[PDB]
């Protein structure tokens, strides 16, 4: 055990569990011979790139699962949400860290994976004849996130049973509590909009339900801490 720091942010975390570098690539920058070599894109290092610790969600027996969108989650938050908004283009890598705090008397298993272009699909009326498009509160939940309503198909008509095909990591209470994931910038373009397009979405679902005997804390706090890697911006407004 030891604590790492990035500016004014200091998190207490375990030595170095197995990290998952999504798709074997490290969030790097973008060279000079690109599309916009004129408007030299300024890369934040100071405060912009540090440890943000989102409002902890409480695991319950009935919990269905949660998901956040990127970069949406932060475009609201602090000095990073500052850049994302008053800037024309954005490319950024991510270090995501998820941890639970539970006694050796709780049981559960959370799959935690990242899914590019996570496009939500609602119920469509029920009988299948209403072309209802997911709201804005469902498409970009912010930093509070949003709860799945049909985990089995990941609110989008895809088996979750196959989500492992994405950069994932498991959190089995009886073995580990913290899971870490490095995500590179993934998109069909070098740069893009930070407010219109959500390159990906963080998924965390209880595959084995939370359980405990009466008397033990009934809710397990899940704490998501995340940090931007090699983040770049272009065209101030």
């Amino acid at each position: 055990v030891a604590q790492l720091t990035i500016g004014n942010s200091t998190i207490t975390t375990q030595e170095a569990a197995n990290i998952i570098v999504g798709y074997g690539e490290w969030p790097s920058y973008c060279s000079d011979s690109d599309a916009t070599a004129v408007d030299k894109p300024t890369r934040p290092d100071v405060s912009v790139n540090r440890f943000y610790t989102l409002d902890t969600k409480l695991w319950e027996k009935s919990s269905k699962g949660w998901y956040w969108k990127f970069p949406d989650v932060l475009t609201e938050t602090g000095v990073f949400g500052q850049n994302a908004q008053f800037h024309y283009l954005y490319r950024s890598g991510f270090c995501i860290h998820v941890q639970c705090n539970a006694s050796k008397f709780h049981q559960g298993a959370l799959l935690v994976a990242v899914l590019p272009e996570y496009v939500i699909g609602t119920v469509a009326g029920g009988t299948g004849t209403e072309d209802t498009h997911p709201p804005y509160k469902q498409t970009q939940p912010g930093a509070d996130g949003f709860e799945l309503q049909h985990p089995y198909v990941l609110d989008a008509g895809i088996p979750i049973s196959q989500l492992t095909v994405c950069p994932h990591q498991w959190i089995n209470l009886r073995t580990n509590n913290c899971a870490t994931i490095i995500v590179p910038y993934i998109n069909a373009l070098p740069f893009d909009s930070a407010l219109n397009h959500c390159n990906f979405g963080l998924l965390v679902v209880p595959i084995s339900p939370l359980d405990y005997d009466q008397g033990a804390t009934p809710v397990i706090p899940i704490t998501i801490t995340l940090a931007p890697m090699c983040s770049e911006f272009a065209g101030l407004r």
């Binding site: 049909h150 989008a156 895809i158």
Partner: peptide, 12 residues
């Protein structure tokens, strides 16, 4: 879109 039938949700 990927919308599906929220009533007729069948097991894989």
């Amino acid at each position: 879109n990927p919308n599906y039938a929220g009533n007729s949700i069948k097991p894989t």
